[PDB]
Symmetry: D3
Subunit: 118 residues, 6 copies
């Protein structure tokens, strides 16, 4: 447990980051399920791009999937430290007109370990 | 326009959903499957899809390995868009198999889901 | 000899799968030469996408290259076992209207080993 | 057309420039940052950008590691195109950090640069 | 339209063929080469092409390594589409070379092949 | 020091190749800064694609970035030998009409090593 290729992280509001691939250049690829009260784009998967560099991570999701659109983007900035990813996020809405319309917060993502099945 | 687009979602009768994110010019298909089918591994979490669109023809395959749950298998669907529906035959192979007889068969019919473009 | 990145497999009807790349996520990339009596899209290369997971493999080719089109897609499902990939395939034709128009069969791909030259 | 295009370059007030090479259909953004900001590591060499465009919304993040100079950090900008300008808030995390308080904040306003299509 | 397209095939006078699968918006070229040139390694099997289109300008390079046969070399062509033809100069480098004098030169002229869109 | 993923090479005319990624198939990805007297498309980054195979390398840049266009492509062919990449390059201009309009030359790229900072 650093920040692995094929890891799953769940924040305090129930949402989950599926990192499926971190290539050698540090480039990240995954998808996000939002379960956060009061927000759109819940319960379906959206694509994640970002970067990893040691314990440092950025990732950003576009809120336009096949089932639902919220005309917005989020970008987390954060770090892996003692079994958690602690992040600060910023959310722009399309058509915004000042940095005052940008919404801010903090998510602490705790891991979930890989079950085997069938 | 109608048919198999980028940014289209399709739910089968077992309640599972194919999220098509992207179709290249190439034909290349990329997306997520969420499995919600009674009796199976790997439900309620999303898994990567690769495949191919060609008018109404479509293949797409899912690797059952994400970071919350793995099922040591791959499914490949093969099908066509016909009447506001995608009609597929699927085959499912389990890691370690030694006989084609161990490859499992089914049929899924995917109907378009409700795009709710609002916050 | 598992199912390798950079391997070449030739079925009973003479056709050949060139797997050039299997990334760590298991995602497969290659190209197919069809030599199967009675079929279109013979003797030129078509692109392959698929997945590998242990000895389990899917791959699918679109039958539209630069020289020739057959308005169809094939998808194999199969497994590596004692120096062979044994597969069942299904072929849709664009504009199909029932699952009865879908053609089925079995290919056993045997390997070929890498010659050095110049 | 105007707005956030493929093949558009944007210089902030510290004199740094975002080179946008490609926006997919997807929304996906790919490009280069050259940092020219007084006081920082990793100036005058280009670094990879990933991110996202959505009308006037835009995120983009830079990994400060190319082969001439590395700074053991990532920056993520978040912003919008408004009046022939992209207005961003950035956050910067250093490898090894243990407190959100160590994440650093700023604001960049990027104005379009001069495209000189000639040899 | 005519010129260097996606989904275009081009055979040179030695009988070899460039299969262009995809040109991005970017300019990026992706495809297969089959070498059919008397006297060489690596014939009759397909090899990956990367490169670049820019109106009538075009580079494209082939790595001579697929799973049936490898030749420990790379070829890079450089050329232009002019009169229903692509006219190229190629350079070929062998792994292990120590002198530019060991880089080999030729000229290929590729004429469009016959697209037979039927089953 | 072979030809690495994450290496930087600077030729005799001051230009620099940033190789950020060489995948296992040998496929190369990077970007070029031109500092060569008498040429367009100086001082900004252009995208590189190519191939590596032992000490053999090809790479090609399209001269169309966000800030400046020169309606041209270059392709180097060359090899790594005793801490240098020695190359021969060929430059086509869009709309060229004979192989006589194609410009030729030789670049010897010497390495630069990775500084740490902040
Ligand atoms: O409502 C929207 O515009 C799209 C969904 C936003 C969800 C936000 S992103 C930051 C925070 N973290 C979550 O897990 N959900 C919310
Ligand atoms: O190996 C497993 O059990 C997990 C994947 C199985 C889900 C199958 S795939 C075909 C069928 N159609 C669905 O919607 N789900 C099941
Ligand atoms: O005729 C077509 O529609 C396109 C070519 C189909 C070739 C099929 S795919 C399954 C089988 N395996 C081969 O090697 N060739 C045939
Ligand atoms: O870690 C470092 O010092 C190197 C990168 C810092 C450059 C920063 S990122 C945000 C700010 N805006 C710029 O244009 N450059 C600085
Ligand atoms: O190293 C080898 O011998 C295999 C590749 C050589 C094929 C060359 S590349 C340039 C020339 N043009 C062709 O059509 N084929 C040859
Ligand atoms: O002027 C142009 O058409 C675009 C820039 C060309 C620069 C050439 S490419 C070969 C040579 N090597 C360099 O470093 N610069 C020149």
């Amino acid at each position: 447990g650093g920040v692995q290729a094929l890891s799953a992280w769940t924040n305090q509001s129930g949402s989950t980051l599926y990192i499926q691939s971190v290539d050698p250049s540090g480039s990240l690829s995954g998808y996000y399920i939002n379960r956060a009260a009061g927000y759109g784009c819940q319960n379906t998967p959206y694509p994640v791009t970002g970067w990893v560099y040691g314990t440092a991570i950025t990732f950003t999701v576009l809120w336009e999937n096949a089932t639902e659109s919220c005309n917005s983007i989020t970008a987390w900035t954060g770090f892996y430290y003692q079994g958690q990813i602690t992040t600060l996020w910023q959310l722009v809405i399309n058509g915004s007109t000042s940095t005052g319309q940008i919404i801010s917060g903090e998510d602490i993502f705790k891991p979930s370990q890989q079950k085997k099945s069938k």
